[PDB]
Design a protein around this ligand. Structure first.
Ligand SMILES: [Cl-]
Ligand SMILES: [Cl-]
Length: 341
């Protein structure tokens, strides 16, 4: 009679996680998947989804903090909550103050995807692939222009990255920071950027038509794996630069009208086990938010600096704060001015 209804991304869990949880607890888990965040968000805002646990983005959960859509997590029913990284917890608290509604599941960054061979051919073995200097210094973008440079069509993320690169507050609330120095540097870099797109760079990296790109980690790993599967000889790598990068989190959350709260808390505690989430990370190739699980992650994933960055880089990570409307308008018009080049 024990029932638990979960809604998650497809292939966003280890193949045997649900089976092991069912065999250990005796609960019958109804595990449904979605291939697009629009479906999950529309169902959640429509209400009465019938799900006990869902996996939305932390930004959507932040947008839905006062709508009564999610249930505040009873921290007393989660003793292993201490296993979570306090640094990543502080990072996600900006989307969820006091970590009230969401348990961080996996996370990724907005970093640099690049062709190793072409970059080291036009910039040498000393190419600063571990720094935004590779793509945010005009002197290097001039030498990289011939092999192809692409930027995301995401003004918020790109502007936050540029503000962090310039030493300013990555989520500055001053419009002068956006219209002034950030716009100045972006317009200085513009003549070397081939296009602004948030999806074409995947296949363009896989085929070698683009050699350096601002990209989300999952997209760059998909491009590199596509190149590997094609056996085309294109070596695509992803780097979280040393100056820091924007981080984004997927979270487990409990809808307010969940009928199986006990089983949901049991599943959350199961996910808080280091070995469980470490196995999940071994399968999905994403870094999890469980510190105690880090030594248990496979050396293939744990020792990848583009997935598990060192402490000095993790201390420079940041999340995207929701901006006041005037900042949004200034950002959009500045991005329109930048893209006109
Ligand atoms: Cl995802
Ligand atoms: Cl994102």
């Amino acid at each position: 009679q024990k029932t638990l209804h979960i809604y998650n991304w497809s292939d966003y869990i280890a193949p045997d996680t649900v089976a092991n949880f069912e065999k250990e607890t005796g609960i019958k888990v109804v595990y449904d998947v979605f291939d697009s965040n629009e479906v999950l968000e529309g169902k959640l805002m429509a209400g009465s989804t019938g799900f006990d646990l869902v996996v939305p983005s932390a930004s959507f959960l932040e947008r839905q903090l006062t709508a009564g859509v999610f249930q505040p997590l009873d921290k007393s029913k989660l003793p292993e909550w201490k296993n979570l990284d306090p640094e990543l917890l502080k990072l996600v608290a900006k989307h969820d103050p006091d970590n009230k509604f969401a348990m961080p599941y996996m996370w990724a960054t907005t970093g640099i995807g690049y062709n190793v061979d072409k970059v080291k051919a036009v910039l040498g073995e000393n190419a600063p692939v571990d720094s935004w200097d590779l793509i945010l210094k005009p002197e290097n973008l001039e030498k990289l222009k011939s092999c192809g440079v692409s930027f995301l069509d995401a003004p918020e993320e790109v502007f936050a990255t540029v503000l962090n690169y310039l030493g300013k507050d990555p989520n500055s609330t001053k419009a002068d920071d956006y219209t002034g120095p950030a716009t100045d540097l972006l317009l200085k870099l513009r003549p070397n950027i081939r296009y602004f797109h948030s999806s074409q760079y995947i296949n363009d990296l896989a085929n070698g038509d683009i050699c350096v790109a601002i990209g989300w980690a999952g997209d760059v790993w998909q491009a590199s794996n596509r190149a590997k599967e094609a056996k085309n000889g294109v070596n695509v790598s992803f780097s979280i630069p040393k100056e820091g990068a924007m981080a984004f989190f997927d979270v487990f959350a409990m809808p307010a009208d969940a009928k199986n709260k006990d089983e949901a808390y049991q599943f959350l505690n199961y996910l808080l086990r280091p070995d469980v989430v470490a196995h999940i990370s071994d399968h999905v190739f994403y870094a999890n938010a469980n510190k105690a699980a880090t030594p248990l992650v496979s050396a293939e994933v744990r020792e990848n600096p583009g997935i598990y960055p060192p402490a000095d880089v993790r201390a420079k990570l940041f999340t995207l704060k929701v901006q006041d409307p005037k900042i949004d308008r200034v950002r959009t018009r500045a991005w329109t001015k930048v893209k006109s080049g």
